[PDB]
Amino acid sequence: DAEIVTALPVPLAVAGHHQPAPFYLTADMFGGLPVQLAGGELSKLVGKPVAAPHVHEVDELYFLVSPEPGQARIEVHLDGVRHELVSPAVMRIPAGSEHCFLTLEATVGSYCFGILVGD
């Protein structure tokens, strides 16, 4: 009687996002989780932002990863300051901070996940 979720991703609306974002962990899964996790593979998102600047009332971690280090690069706008992240990298976005990211470079298998931390 294992607990398996394969109806994935779960599209959920997120502030400023053009489309609902694809979630793989949501707060209600498995009786409740302290995180939510959304994101996807970046290879076709180069130069195409998924959202306008937005703010959350919870902390958000960007997790950027690729099979080989350096194969993925995103630009994070944080309250009007630009930060370039190179895979692998984890960046904390404090709750209340205005932000978004733009994909600069991505191979097949590059991902950016946003991890919302429940407080």
Ligand X SMILES: C/C(=C(\O)C(=O)O)c1c[nH]c2ccccc12
Nearest to 67 by CA among 37, 19, 107, 7: 107
What is the spatial distance between Cα 84 and Cα 96, in angstroms, rounded to a whole number? 20
- Paired residues of 41 in beta bridges: 111
Q: What is the contact mask toward ligand 5RN in residues 36 to 55, using x (rule: CB under 6 A)?
A: --xxx---------x-----
Closest of 51, 27, 31, 33 to residue 112, by C-alpha: 51
User: Is 60 annotated as contributing to ligand binding?
Assistant: yes
- The answer to whether the CB of 100 falls within 8 A of the CB of 112 is no
What secondary structure letter does DSSP report for 31? G
Residues found near a copy of itself in the complex (CB under 8 A): 2-6, 8-9, 24-25, 29-30, 33-35, 37, 41, 43, 59, 61, 63, 65-67, 76, 78, 81, 83, 85-86, 88-92, 107-111, 115, 117-118
**Which residue lies nearest ligand 5RN, judged by its C-beta?**
114
- Contact residues toward ligand X (CB under 6 A) are 14, 21, 38-40, 50-51, 60, 100-101, 112-114
Give binding residues for Fe(3+) as ranges. 54, 56, 60, 99
